[PDB]
């Protein structure tokens, strides 16, 4: 969608190659983020002498109370000024930036 | 007669006997893996503008979030690694790291903690003994490549005995001029420039004619079992850093120019089989020390 | 095994066109050819059984590095199923087909000095059977046509009366002669008689029976190609054709 | 009295004073990162059975899509890197590349232009001077391993003075035979095979007995601040390539066998601190040159 | 007059002429690519806490699934790689790998079969001949750095002729004391410590003053076309491993301390341009051998 | 031996158009100025249609 | 002894050092492509019975629609090409054309600025020196075909030494009568009419018998890297036109009859490699000048 290519062309490209194509066009959202684990207060049932864990939703660090990516504000602004699917104008970038905010 | 020996093989000091168990070896392996991720995180933080890779790598290593106005020191893991390295070098160095701290740090990553997966080649040449007649002069210089200068001032040709030990696997000798070499009590071949020898074959006799001096350049290869993550370049760089950082100044310890000649010297001592096991763990600790200190200087 | 199964002149020459020289050459050390040895045949005798090893056995032997050994390895592959140990021949010669070596000057191999009588004696023509002698004579004729030694081939046949009677009739340059030929050259095949899983006394007979029993297993194996049931699945290039012509013939 | 000095320490020529600002250092860092990606694109190309990974990296590096007939040379970035390398070596080298071009090329990648993030250890041995009595002979050979062969012919034992400078952190001496060495105005100890010295301690006195020659082998370690991406293996390869291509062929300049000798010689000059900062940027430039030219040989 | 030559340049044995076609060149490159994946599979196994990455890597390399209680030897690919290394070293070594087996293994992965994509710098210094007058003595020691010791016992100053061959690109000469060097008919310059020379310039004349001996240290750089995946660190390790394993143990061959010496010696021999092509494929074969055997020690 | 042409000028081996620079050409049309010195109405319409 | 040398090899003046960057080389390539289209527009004009093909090509070249009264001269591109040509010839020539104008003109066509895609063969014969005994006379005449007329008057046969340099690849000698020629310190063969020599072999000795004069005709072939578009027929025509128009009329410069003599003379200078790269760009500039001026004579 963003780089105006077909599925057959990007069929053989690897993850590293695909990440470079989107980053060159100005798209920074090409990375997965690991959720932060939170330990349960009590021992889980049927798990004697063991510590439980679970992931915090929406990839928000509980200590910082914000997203794991500290540069998310900068990335959204970069998407806003980017030029996708059209050399002139920012219709696609503004729509995605406003939606992502 | 006269006897000459390699300088680096003289008086190898005893090594430490602490932190050599399976759990301690796991801690050294974990530190090497996490220290490697610290260096790799810098390049990942350049491809993507985010500092997430470094924050994740440092948080795992130091158990605290990096701060802008606070010096990055490595946390409890850095202190444990530095003190553990001191213990390996000498038996007089104190062992002050609690075992409960070592076990806690070894649980950060799941690694084998195994020391004998692979091998490596060490280039130090162990010229244990060179025996020469009365009217000859022999001088040995060098450790990675040893040049033996021999001059015969006597009336006739002299026989010089070379002893390379039993540890080294292969020794290649190249001379400035063609020379003759053979084993004890064996017929002598025609003169040729280079010889390939097995040190276990026995003492080697060299004919030294009267006239211009003959110089023999020696190179040796030795195989020592090491972890699969062992990297000689990183170990050598870490060895120099530890000496400059003061980790090796203990009373009554020998000093070496390279880790290569340190492990070979310990291997040629008595109970050298047991000493090499400790030295290999020290090498992986030095490999972790180099990567961590380059990422977090001082 | 595949070379021993061919039963017509057309199939034999077609196989040799698609088979490179490296199949004739063996990379196993083997043993020296002519030796009086004692082998074990426990099905028949308690004592060791004397025999003499030879180059036309089914097991690889050591071969001379000269051109004579190379031709003698090709013929032994055709008549016995295995070649000899001649290493370091070279990539250029080994990639060529067996027919190219026997028939073409562009290979770079010179074979005009070969003596058919000495080659036949070294291959123990006396021990060969009728099919084996016919196959070797095919190799001789191809070599004679390559070197322009047709007259010498005919004189050698005149000296050897039994060889003249069984000499195959085909001109090595005309494909019409190969199609007409009806000589049976098969060494292994489906047996009409009773074939049992029993040993043979001599090295040659025992090794031959191994190929015969192996061919039966190969015939019912999944590797065998059944023309009657799977002719459409064969590639067009290697599909059987009535108007099949060797290149240059 | 006779004075002997190391060959590579003599007369360090002045280094260039251009392309040392923050913008220019960022350009060198950008080129190194882009050149590194170019080399790894070849391995990725084999895995993908396509030229897409290489075409991507060359487009970033050279700002043009390659054509099959054209010989790939690196484009404007390769030209800028070459001229920048010549300027660093000598003050007589002209500065062709304008600052506008440097700033444009520095924006291609998002990497800092810092040069003080990490450190490196250099092994050149700085024997500044050796002062010896009249009836003795002293010869100094080698840079990475300095062998000092001393022979006296006088009746009495001679005292030889060794000066290793102030820059080096650690110097380790090993002799063919045990010898005596002590600091200035300090008691002489017993003969030992090896000595570990701090060059800041002062000049060192070696007792040279009359008889057979005594050879001392010297190794040194020096810490110099470098970028984290610094790799000594690639820098040394780039140094030889630059000499081979004639990038250093300028009037009134000195020549060195390795980048280790070059940076240590400049550090021992009067303005050593200012000179070293320029030399470190040259090392990263040479690291980029080695990677770029191996991927795109011309 | 006297003639002195480097030991490693004497009598290069003929190299193999087999497995040099395009099909076999792909096999060596494919083996290197797949042998590398074995090394990285160890790290990926630790991160994932599973043996799945190693199973995929070994299955592609060996064509059988890994099994406990079975010594992991590498399968048919390891056997073929060992034998082609044997054939490359000597022309008399038999070639026992069928071409159909080479083609089958080369189809396991798709790689660029070109062995001339890139270049490498080699540090062995060629001293073909040193011509000296009657009253002078010359000795040559070393291969990576050649130290030439000349002593003048005659009444007058002597002229020493240095011949560095024609293959080397640049040669750097450094002396213990300043010396004068010029071309055959060029006038002598003022004495200086270092000289940079082009070997194709011609024979070089060095004046040798009477008195203390003069020592000249030589360093050379040579460019040889190599595949892009070539790595000098891995080739050298494989060269030592192959020598210890006995892969080079065959009659009527020469032995060298390093792959650097081997490739330079063959370059200077008759028909050198077509000998180095075979040696480059041997280096890539040895690079694969080192990585595979460290992952699977037998 | 029989033969026939692959439809739509697509190379069967590469599974894409014979022209490898088709992506670049479409982008060039998008920024082009046709029938009017100011604006890209004609270029955008043709580029979107051709994609 | 008397020394005779080729006239065109004497004193090559330094070439310019401007307009050698990637952008400037692209401008020369653009001009050559545009000038070539201008010539072919005339043939297309005749077929179409209109001036439309010519007006199209002149508009691209000169950035203006021609008027009937105006004398077509090429506009800014023609002026830029002329001044660039003068700058290449001499280091004393000023560089009038700014870099901004060059970059604007280089964007008019989509063609690479490479200069190493192809090669060309040049036929100038480099007789560097001919050394002859006292009683003999030697004269050298010609560049494309060098005729050496030698006559001796002494009683004995004379030996004449020929030096053809190191750059040339092949030199073929033919004599009026069969003569004897052999390499230095090599046995003299029987008299032959023709000899094929490699200049790198060394100086060649010619036996000159007493009697009638002996004339040797020499032809040489040298390979120089050039762009694919290089055409020797057009370059030589452009060289004469440039001399006719006075583009090369600068103080302290040498003059040559052909571009073959010019490029070969510069190749034999001390900095031959650097000089040749500049001369190749001049050749393509002269190729464009020949086409542009023939289409638009002024």
PDB file of N, CA, C and O in Angstrom, chain B residues 272-297:
ATOM      1  N   UNK B 272      49.082 -29.642  34.687  1.00  0.00           N
ATOM      2  CA  UNK B 272      48.647 -28.682  33.692  1.00  0.00           C
ATOM      3  C   UNK B 272      47.298 -28.992  33.082  1.00  0.00           C
ATOM      4  O   UNK B 272      46.656 -28.089  32.539  1.00  0.00           O
ATOM      5  N   UNK B 273      46.855 -30.248  33.158  1.00  0.00           N
ATOM      6  CA  UNK B 273      45.517 -30.590  32.687  1.00  0.00           C
ATOM      7  C   UNK B 273      44.466 -29.834  33.487  1.00  0.00           C
ATOM      8  O   UNK B 273      43.516 -29.276  32.924  1.00  0.00           O
ATOM      9  N   UNK B 274      44.625 -29.791  34.809  1.00  0.00           N
ATOM     10  CA  UNK B 274      43.655 -29.111  35.658  1.00  0.00           C
ATOM     11  C   UNK B 274      43.768 -27.596  35.563  1.00  0.00           C
ATOM     12  O   UNK B 274      42.764 -26.894  35.728  1.00  0.00           O
ATOM     13  N   UNK B 275      44.969 -27.075  35.307  1.00  0.00           N
ATOM     14  CA  UNK B 275      45.151 -25.629  35.247  1.00  0.00           C
ATOM     15  C   UNK B 275      44.484 -25.030  34.016  1.00  0.00           C
ATOM     16  O   UNK B 275      43.952 -23.916  34.073  1.00  0.00           O
ATOM     17  N   UNK B 276      44.499 -25.753  32.894  1.00  0.00           N
ATOM     18  CA  UNK B 276      43.918 -25.228  31.662  1.00  0.00           C
ATOM     19  C   UNK B 276      42.412 -25.058  31.797  1.00  0.00           C
ATOM     20  O   UNK B 276      41.835 -24.117  31.236  1.00  0.00           O
ATOM     21  N   UNK B 277      41.751 -25.950  32.537  1.00  0.00           N
ATOM     22  CA  UNK B 277      40.313 -25.816  32.744  1.00  0.00           C
ATOM     23  C   UNK B 277      39.969 -24.475  33.377  1.00  0.00           C
ATOM     24  O   UNK B 277      39.022 -23.805  32.952  1.00  0.00           O
ATOM     25  N   UNK B 278      40.731 -24.063  34.391  1.00  0.00           N
ATOM     26  CA  UNK B 278      40.500 -22.764  35.010  1.00  0.00           C
ATOM     27  C   UNK B 278      40.836 -21.624  34.057  1.00  0.00           C
ATOM     28  O   UNK B 278      40.126 -20.614  34.013  1.00  0.00           O
ATOM     29  N   UNK B 279      41.915 -21.768  33.284  1.00  0.00           N
ATOM     30  CA  UNK B 279      42.324 -20.702  32.377  1.00  0.00           C
ATOM     31  C   UNK B 279      41.299 -20.466  31.276  1.00  0.00           C
ATOM     32  O   UNK B 279      41.113 -19.324  30.842  1.00  0.00           O
ATOM     33  N   UNK B 280      40.636 -21.524  30.809  1.00  0.00           N
ATOM     34  CA  UNK B 280      39.629 -21.366  29.765  1.00  0.00           C
ATOM     35  C   UNK B 280      38.445 -20.557  30.281  1.00  0.00           C
ATOM     36  O   UNK B 280      37.899 -19.708  29.567  1.00  0.00           O
ATOM     37  N   UNK B 281      38.036 -20.797  31.530  1.00  0.00           N
ATOM     38  CA  UNK B 281      36.958 -20.003  32.116  1.00  0.00           C
ATOM     39  C   UNK B 281      37.386 -18.549  32.257  1.00  0.00           C
ATOM     40  O   UNK B 281      36.575 -17.629  32.099  1.00  0.00           O
ATOM     41  N   UNK B 282      38.664 -18.317  32.561  1.00  0.00           N
ATOM     42  CA  UNK B 282      39.167 -16.950  32.620  1.00  0.00           C
ATOM     43  C   UNK B 282      39.117 -16.282  31.254  1.00  0.00           C
ATOM     44  O   UNK B 282      38.870 -15.075  31.165  1.00  0.00           O
ATOM     45  N   UNK B 283      39.338 -17.045  30.184  1.00  0.00           N
ATOM     46  CA  UNK B 283      39.278 -16.468  28.852  1.00  0.00           C
ATOM     47  C   UNK B 283      37.889 -15.985  28.482  1.00  0.00           C
ATOM     48  O   UNK B 283      37.731 -14.905  27.907  1.00  0.00           O
ATOM     49  N   UNK B 284      36.864 -16.777  28.802  1.00  0.00           N
ATOM     50  CA  UNK B 284      35.498 -16.352  28.521  1.00  0.00           C
ATOM     51  C   UNK B 284      35.089 -15.177  29.396  1.00  0.00           C
ATOM     52  O   UNK B 284      34.320 -14.314  28.956  1.00  0.00           O
ATOM     53  N   UNK B 285      35.588 -15.126  30.632  1.00  0.00           N
ATOM     54  CA  UNK B 285      35.351 -13.960  31.476  1.00  0.00           C
ATOM     55  C   UNK B 285      36.019 -12.722  30.895  1.00  0.00           C
ATOM     56  O   UNK B 285      35.456 -11.623  30.944  1.00  0.00           O
ATOM     57  N   UNK B 286      37.224 -12.879  30.345  1.00  0.00           N
ATOM     58  CA  UNK B 286      37.898 -11.755  29.705  1.00  0.00           C
ATOM     59  C   UNK B 286      37.176 -11.333  28.433  1.00  0.00           C
ATOM     60  O   UNK B 286      37.139 -10.142  28.101  1.00  0.00           O
ATOM     61  N   UNK B 287      36.610 -12.293  27.701  1.00  0.00           N
ATOM     62  CA  UNK B 287      35.815 -11.955  26.526  1.00  0.00           C
ATOM     63  C   UNK B 287      34.596 -11.129  26.911  1.00  0.00           C
ATOM     64  O   UNK B 287      34.243 -10.166  26.220  1.00  0.00           O
ATOM     65  N   UNK B 288      33.937 -11.493  28.011  1.00  0.00           N
ATOM     66  CA  UNK B 288      32.823 -10.693  28.505  1.00  0.00           C
ATOM     67  C   UNK B 288      33.301  -9.346  29.026  1.00  0.00           C
ATOM     68  O   UNK B 288      32.618  -8.329  28.853  1.00  0.00           O
ATOM     69  N   UNK B 289      34.466  -9.320  29.676  1.00  0.00           N
ATOM     70  CA  UNK B 289      34.987  -8.076  30.229  1.00  0.00           C
ATOM     71  C   UNK B 289      35.278  -7.060  29.132  1.00  0.00           C
ATOM     72  O   UNK B 289      35.012  -5.864  29.299  1.00  0.00           O
ATOM     73  N   UNK B 290      35.835  -7.514  28.009  1.00  0.00           N
ATOM     74  CA  UNK B 290      36.185  -6.596  26.930  1.00  0.00           C
ATOM     75  C   UNK B 290      34.943  -5.947  26.334  1.00  0.00           C
ATOM     76  O   UNK B 290      34.889  -4.725  26.164  1.00  0.00           O
ATOM     77  N   UNK B 291      33.933  -6.754  26.007  1.00  0.00           N
ATOM     78  CA  UNK B 291      32.731  -6.212  25.384  1.00  0.00           C
ATOM     79  C   UNK B 291      31.988  -5.280  26.329  1.00  0.00           C
ATOM     80  O   UNK B 291      31.459  -4.246  25.904  1.00  0.00           O
ATOM     81  N   UNK B 292      31.929  -5.629  27.615  1.00  0.00           N
ATOM     82  CA  UNK B 292      31.213  -4.791  28.568  1.00  0.00           C
ATOM     83  C   UNK B 292      31.922  -3.458  28.778  1.00  0.00           C
ATOM     84  O   UNK B 292      31.273  -2.408  28.844  1.00  0.00           O
ATOM     85  N   UNK B 293      33.251  -3.477  28.873  1.00  0.00           N
ATOM     86  CA  UNK B 293      33.981  -2.248  29.164  1.00  0.00           C
ATOM     87  C   UNK B 293      34.041  -1.323  27.957  1.00  0.00           C
ATOM     88  O   UNK B 293      34.050  -0.098  28.121  1.00  0.00           O
ATOM     89  N   UNK B 294      34.094  -1.876  26.745  1.00  0.00           N
ATOM     90  CA  UNK B 294      34.030  -1.032  25.557  1.00  0.00           C
ATOM     91  C   UNK B 294      32.675  -0.344  25.444  1.00  0.00           C
ATOM     92  O   UNK B 294      32.596   0.822  25.039  1.00  0.00           O
ATOM     93  N   UNK B 295      31.598  -1.047  25.795  1.00  0.00           N
ATOM     94  CA  UNK B 295      30.274  -0.438  25.760  1.00  0.00           C
ATOM     95  C   UNK B 295      30.093   0.564  26.894  1.00  0.00           C
ATOM     96  O   UNK B 295      29.469   1.614  26.708  1.00  0.00           O
ATOM     97  N   UNK B 296      30.630   0.259  28.075  1.00  0.00           N
ATOM     98  CA  UNK B 296      30.479   1.097  29.263  1.00  0.00           C
ATOM     99  C   UNK B 296      31.856   1.388  29.842  1.00  0.00           C
ATOM    100  O   UNK B 296      32.280   0.752  30.816  1.00  0.00           O
ATOM    101  N   UNK B 297      32.588   2.338  29.261  1.00  0.00           N
ATOM    102  CA  UNK B 297      33.927   2.651  29.770  1.00  0.00           C
ATOM    103  C   UNK B 297      33.882   3.188  31.193  1.00  0.00           C
ATOM    104  O   UNK B 297      32.978   3.939  31.565  1.00  0.00           O
TER     105      UNK B 297
END
